[PDB]
């Protein structure tokens, strides 16, 4: 059940995959990788709805609490990327520290999390694409999820997934320079909203600071936690990094700490321009600029959001596909094969099927539910890795660690407590989907999962 995977074995698979691949990537390229995976739908969309219905102007404290939970968690991931510098996240770490049973549960949870996160990202993207087009407007009933009045499907959200699914299937190799271009488009547009929006900030809009009390700051924090998911993606590039033991921890923590500051500033400027009660909009940042008659800058920020949110979508789908290739190689799920040449067949993952699943949920499920369901799965993964550092310090203490978590028990415990606190802040119905999904996975392990590449 708790049969651990030796770190030596994880080095061999990473060393076989990254033998051909060229190494250039440094601390800067990995910070871009991190920022690219972090800034997206969370800050561009969730921030509006969360300020209007959960915290109000106090959404800034809701970003601090939520931001602190991720810092303590990211510090744990950095110790893991320093110690096990292989192309892989939480699934690989749990397999080395806890063992097969914990790695399967978390693994199966993240198959859902990356899928559900892609739908939430694509729903957010749609609201910015629709907002930009008007000023145009498509058929009224193909603009959002199925409610009681109007809309049936969110067609732009269905379409963007299919465009991303077509790109990943085209097999076009990644360019670190091209990623520096898009990440700068995203960073510059955020700074532009801050620099232009500061002039129109009415401190009157901040006066009823905590209208929903601290209870509202806490539920708000569980929502806007989503915006911080993405720092784990720095482990992808491990087979292309010269010295990954000290560059990947830098990338993880730096990309996170940068975004936390932008996030605090965006919250203040947003609630400062528009009264909290008017921010429940599909495009809050474009709306705030339109509210104060900066129409040209608003469209320019809508463009940056479209291009910038698209990179979040590509990462999420890739991280899921990579995760399916890892679970099946370990024998915990069956092996699919497809001919790469007319006479040469290799292991395959059906991206058209994994992408179709995402496209459907993106077109029918409201953003809030999708985000809340990603938040539960991610918080439990974060708690697992945090304890993983402690378990790896007790068992296997001799391992080389270029980066070490500052305070040996305290910080990993704090991450467990802060994340644990945010889990208790999510709606009760969010547990129905998450738990039932885990029961399905737990059944899979006893029937199939015990017929894998470590039973021997």
């Amino acid at each position: 059940l708790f049969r651990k995977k030796p770190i030596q074995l994880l080095m061999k698979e990473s060393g076989a995959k990254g033998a051909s691949l060229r190494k250039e990537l440094g601390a800067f390229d990995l910070t871009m990788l991190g920022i690219g995976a972090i800034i997206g739908t969370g800050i561009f969309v969730l921030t509006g709805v969360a300020a209007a219905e959960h915290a109000g102007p106090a959404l800034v404290l809701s970003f601090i609490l939520s931001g602190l939970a991720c810092v303590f968690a990211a510090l744990c991931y950095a110790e893991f990327a320093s110690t096990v510098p292989v192309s892989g996240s939480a699934y690989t770490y749990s397999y080395a520290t806890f063992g097969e049973l914990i790695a399967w549960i978390l693994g199966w949870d993240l198959i859902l999390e990356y899928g559900v996160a892609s739908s939430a990202v694509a729903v957010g993207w749609s609201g910015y694409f629709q907002g930009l087009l008007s000023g145009e407007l498509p058929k009224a009933l193909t603009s959002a999820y199925d409610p009681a009045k109007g809309t049936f499907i969110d067609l732009p959200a269905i379409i963007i997934v299919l465009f991303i699914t077509f790109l990943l299937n085209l097999g076009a190799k990644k360019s670190a320079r091209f990623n520096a271009v898009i990440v700068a488009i995203k960073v510059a547009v955020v700074l532009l909203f801050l620099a232009v929006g500061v002039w129109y900030v009415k401190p009157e809009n901040w006066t009823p600071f905590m209208p929903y009390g601290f209870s509202g700051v806490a539920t708000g924090a569980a929502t806007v936690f989503f915006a911080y998911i993405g720092f784990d993606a720095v482990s992808t590039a491990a087979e292309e990094v010269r010295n990954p033991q000290r560059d990947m921890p830098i990338g993880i923590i730096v990309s996170l700490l940068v975004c936390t500051l932008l996030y605090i500033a965006v919250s203040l400027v947003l609630t400062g321009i528009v009264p909290y009660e008017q921010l429940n909009v599909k495009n809050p940042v474009a709306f705030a600029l339109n509210y104060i008659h900066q129409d040209w800058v608003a469209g320019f920020i809508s463009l940056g959001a479209i291009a910038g949110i698209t990179t979040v979508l590509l990462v999420m789908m890739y991280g899921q596909t990579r995760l399916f290739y890892a679970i099946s190689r370990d024998g915990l799920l069956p092996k699919v094969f497809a001919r790469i040449s007319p006479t040469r067949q290799v292991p395959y993952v059906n991206t058209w099927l994994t992408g179709a699943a995402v496209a459907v949920f993106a077109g029918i499920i409201p953003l809030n539910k999708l985000a809340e369901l990603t938040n539960i799965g991610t918080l439990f993964a974060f708690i697992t890795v945090s304890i993983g550092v402690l378990v790896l310090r007790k068992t296997q203490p001799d391992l080389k660690r270029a980066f070490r978590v500052p305070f040996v028990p305290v910080v990993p415990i704090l991450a467990v407590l802060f994340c644990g606190y945010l889990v208790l802040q999510l709606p009760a119905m969010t547990w129905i989907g998450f738990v039932s999904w885990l029961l399905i996975g737990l059944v899979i392990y006893f029937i199939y999962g015990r017929k894998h590449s470590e039973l021997n």
Binding site: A184, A188, V196
Partner: peptide, 27 residues
């Protein structure tokens, strides 16, 4: 790297130039 740092820095400046410009010409 290096080229990737310069490429990043240059586009921030291009967008911040174009942005500050368009912002000036508004009610």
């Amino acid at each position: 790297m290096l080229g990737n740092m310069n490429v990043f820095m240059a586009v921030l400046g291009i967008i911040l130039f174009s942005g500050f410009l368009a912002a000036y010409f508004s009610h």
